């Protein structure tokens, strides 16, 4: 039991990973899996960032 937040008491823990090219990922589960539907093909280039502004 956990404190109530946003009209929900159960909590989902979010995890992520980076698959290198030419590699395989395997999901095994018998319960409590929030499976992926969309992945992202990252193209890396210098000269960016995240800023906070109004």
């Amino acid at each position: 039991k956990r404190p109530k937040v946003r009209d929900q008491e159960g909590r989902i823990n979010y995890y992520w990973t980076l698959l290198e090219p030419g590699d395989t990922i395997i999901f095994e589960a018998n319960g409590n899996l929030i499976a992926p539907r969309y992945a992202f093909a990252l193209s890396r280039g210098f000269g960016s960032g995240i800023i906070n502004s109004n």
């Binding site: 909590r11 929030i34 539907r37 193209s43 960016s48």
Partner: protein, 107 residues
């Protein structure tokens, strides 16, 4: 919405789905439309660092909804994550529940 909400596909900001290339990301100082379902985002700051150096990405169906889980029901909606009032869920994740009273193992 924040980087977590953008990357998980928060139901209440889908206008960023179309965008694929950028020069920099602008986030509100105190974002409010983040992870709708409460919980912990593992290595959130590391993911922000990784996304600080991506010029573009392509969104693809890692596991197609229509033809990947025939032994499970892939329709799970939360009251917390509600689009236009109607309950919904993240656009990049699937909540899986037992079908016919059974939850088979998946690999």
């Amino acid at each position: 919405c924040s980087v977590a909400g953008w990357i998980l596909g928060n139901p209440e900001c889908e206008l960023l789905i179309s965008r694929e290339s950028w020069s920099y990301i602008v986030e509100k100082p105190n974002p409010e439309n983040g992870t709708c379902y409460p919980g912990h985002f593992a290595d959130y700051e590391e993911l922000r660092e990784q996304l600080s150096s991506v010029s573009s990405f392509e969104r693809f169906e890692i596991f197609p909804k229509e033809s990947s889980w025939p032994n499970h029901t892939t329709t799970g909606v939360s009251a917390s994550c509600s689009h236009n009032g109607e309950s919904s869920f993240y656009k990049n994740l699937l909540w899986l529940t037992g079908k016919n009273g059974l939850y088979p193992n998946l690999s």
